[PDB]
Design a protein around this ligand. Structure first.
Ligand SMILES: C[C@H]1c2cccc(O)c2C(=O)C2=C(O)[C@]3(O)C(=O)C(C(N)=O)=C(O)[C@@H](N(C)C)[C@@H]3[C@@H](O)[C@@H]21
Ligand SMILES: C[C@H]1c2cccc(O)c2C(=O)C2=C(O)[C@]3(O)C(=O)C(C(N)=O)=C(O)[C@@H](N(C)C)[C@@H]3[C@@H](O)[C@@H]21
Ligand SMILES: [Cl-]
Ligand SMILES: [Cl-]
Ligand SMILES: [Cl-]
Ligand SMILES: [Cl-]
Ligand SMILES: [Cl-]
Ligand SMILES: [Cl-]
Ligand SMILES: [Cl-]
Ligand SMILES: [Cl-]
Ligand SMILES: [Cl-]
Ligand SMILES: [Cl-]
Ligand SMILES: [Cl-]
Ligand SMILES: [Cl-]
Ligand SMILES: [Mg+2]
Ligand SMILES: [Mg+2]
Lengths: 203, 203
């Protein structure tokens, strides 16, 4: 079939949902595109190059809150950005693992620069603005990977549970982690705010 | 060589540091133990069972702040627990990926039950206590995986960087993520505290 960049990425994402990141191979992508492995090679040099592109294209296609709205507070921006980032990572099997270890791509430079600038224009130093963006990013990726990797490992396999653990697993498994993620996200944003507002005051 | 559980785990962790989680195979563990693959099989049924055990044994051996000190505040306990958890995950190559998707093991039941009880005895509901423990856990795992997966992907490969990104990458890469992790950890703990102290007050 068609091997332009957009068609390759469509087929790779389709394959990702069927196989997960570990079982995703260029050999299985060739089968799905109806081509021989050396044909695919001209287009897609290895698995690493494929994963690097998927990580970019998943946010391009499905992360619709990269940028603040005109006049939006930094608190509201981080909340909306994290909810969007989370949605985009969950939309594909092993989506957080696909994002992990990447750094912003050249196609993302204007986006991420605007996010860092916006934090500095709302009274954060670059460093404190970066620490908040990194904390939100790590917390959101951690929460998604815990969800996704939990699903995954459920293709492996106690009445011996002590009672608070038993109840805690009941609670954790009552949604895709949305409740726990949103509660933690408010805690993190509020902690950022207490720090920003404090200036040089002992806090 | 010796194939008791402790010797197998010693050799597997040694192998993990040489290969990483993706390149860790029962076939390479057999070579390192000087045995045939069917000998190893009697001891170690597959990679999943090995990873599940390593995840438990890494914290058993190297996470020394599982439990609060007598009279320790919940704030201090979460901080010390997160710093210890982080140290233990970083001690082996791909250590966070080894932890990911596991749930507490039977050998960890008394430990994790004590942690959940301790949060409830410091005025959290089980649910709000679990949300704080999960947020700390997700944030810490996210921060470690970002570090570890960054190292990993550096076995793949711009003057075009816009200036705040360029400076942000300089900052991020000035340590193993310790500064950014500790700053975010204080933000999260303080947000937990503002929530706890608020009770039913609008906050
Ligand atoms: C500024 C970026 C950055 C800076 C320095 C080192 C980095 O590794 C990063 C990122 O990896 C970023 C992302 O991946 C974003 O998810 C990212 O790329 C992004 C986006 N494409 O819209 C986001 O929404 C961001 N968000 C907080 C989850 C986040 C970026 O802020 C950072
Ligand atoms: C209570 C545990 C739990 C409850 C319900 C579902 C879960 O998946 C968990 C865990 O996975 C826990 C851990 O892995 C700990 O890291 C965990 O097992 C642990 C330990 N062995 O000492 C920790 O120090 C904990 N810490 C916050 C990082 C954390 C545990 O609190 C939780
Ligand atoms: Cl066609
Ligand atoms: Cl074509
Ligand atoms: Cl195209
Ligand atoms: Cl491949
Ligand atoms: Cl990452
Ligand atoms: Cl600027
Ligand atoms: Cl011996
Ligand atoms: Cl033996
Ligand atoms: Cl033993
Ligand atoms: Cl294997
Ligand atoms: Cl996990
Ligand atoms: Cl109890
Ligand atoms: Mg990123
Ligand atoms: Mg765990």
């Amino acid at each position: 079939s068609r091997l332009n960049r957009e068609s390759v990425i469509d087929a790779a994402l389709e394959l990702l949902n069927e196989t997960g990141i570990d079982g995703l191979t260029t050999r299985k992508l060739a089968q799905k595109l109806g081509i021989e492995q050396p044909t695919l090679y001209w287009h897609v040099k290895n698995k690493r190059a494929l994963l690097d592109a998927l990580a970019v294209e998943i946010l391009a296609r499905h992360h619709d809150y990269s940028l603040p709205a005109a006049g939006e507070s930094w608190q509201s921006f981080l909340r909306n950005n994290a909810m969007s980032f989370r949605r985009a990572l969950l939309r594909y099997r092993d989506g957080a693992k696909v994002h992990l270890g990447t750094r912003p791509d050249e196609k993302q430079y204007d986006t991420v620069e605007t996010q860092l600038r916006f934090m500095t224009e709302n009274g954060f130093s670059l460093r404190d603005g970066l620490y908040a963006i990194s904390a939100v990013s790590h917390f959101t990726l951690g929460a998604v990977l815990a969800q996704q990797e939990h699903t995954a490992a459920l293709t492996d396999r106690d009445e011996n549970l002590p009672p608070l653990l038993r109840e805690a697993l009941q609670i954790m498994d009552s949604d895709d982690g949305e409740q726990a993620f949103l509660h933690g996200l408010e805690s993190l944003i509020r902690g950022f705010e207490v720090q920003l507002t404090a200036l040089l005051q002992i806090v």
